[model samples]
Target: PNLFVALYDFVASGDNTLSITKGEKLRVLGYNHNGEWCEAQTKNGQGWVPSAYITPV
Candidate 1:
């Protein structure tokens, strides 16, 4: 699995949004052709994460 580190904290803003905190690690399944949202999986759960907030390691 590909892992990415969260650079900013985010709340679930819309449907199926994934909440992430600063310095949180996430497993990214994939993004829709480098779209604005990415599907990230973490201990908290799984849902959408904004691509701008996360960086792959």
Candidate 2:
């Protein structure tokens, strides 16, 4: 599976969503708009994240 590493912290808006922390690892499910946001799956759950915060690993 494709992977990425989070460069900084990110908080989600809803109760059911999970937050991403610096140095966190995520599976690359998909992305949009050359990085407007990215779709990722982490150990806890899956959600859209700011693409600027992640890099290929």
Candidate 3:
């Protein structure tokens, strides 16, 4: 399992719409073809986040 953390704060909803705070831990499920966005599973649920804002842990 791939681990990652939020590098900054972001706000969105369920459909790629979600929220993430700096230093939040995340479990990576996969990524989009372009790799600009990644599908991640958090305690809240799974959503798409900008790949740029996350770093592998």
Overall lDDT per candidate, in order of appearance: 0.89, 0.81, 0.85
Q: For candidate 1, lDDT tens digit of each residue in 22-43?
A: 9989898877775988888999
Per-candidate TM-scores read 0.88, 0.80, 0.85
lDDT of 1 at 33: 75
| Ranking according to TM-score, highest score first | 1, 3, 2
Predicted model with the maximum TM-score: 1
Q: How far is candidate 3 from the true structure (C-alpha RMSD, Å)?
A: 1.7
Candidate 1 lDDT (Cα, whole model)? 0.89
lDDT of 3: 0.85
Measured with C-alpha atoms, the lDDT of residue 53 in candidate 2 is 83
lDDT of 2: 0.81
Candidate 1: Cα lDDT at 43: 94
Give the winner by TM-score: 1 or 2: 1
lDDT of 3 by residue, 1-57 (tens): 678899999888556555889999999877789888888888888788888999988
lDDT of 3 at 2: 78
Ranking by lDDT: 1, 3, 2
Model 3 spans > 4 angstroms off: none
As a whole number from 0 to 100, the lDDT of residue 54 in candidate 1 is 96
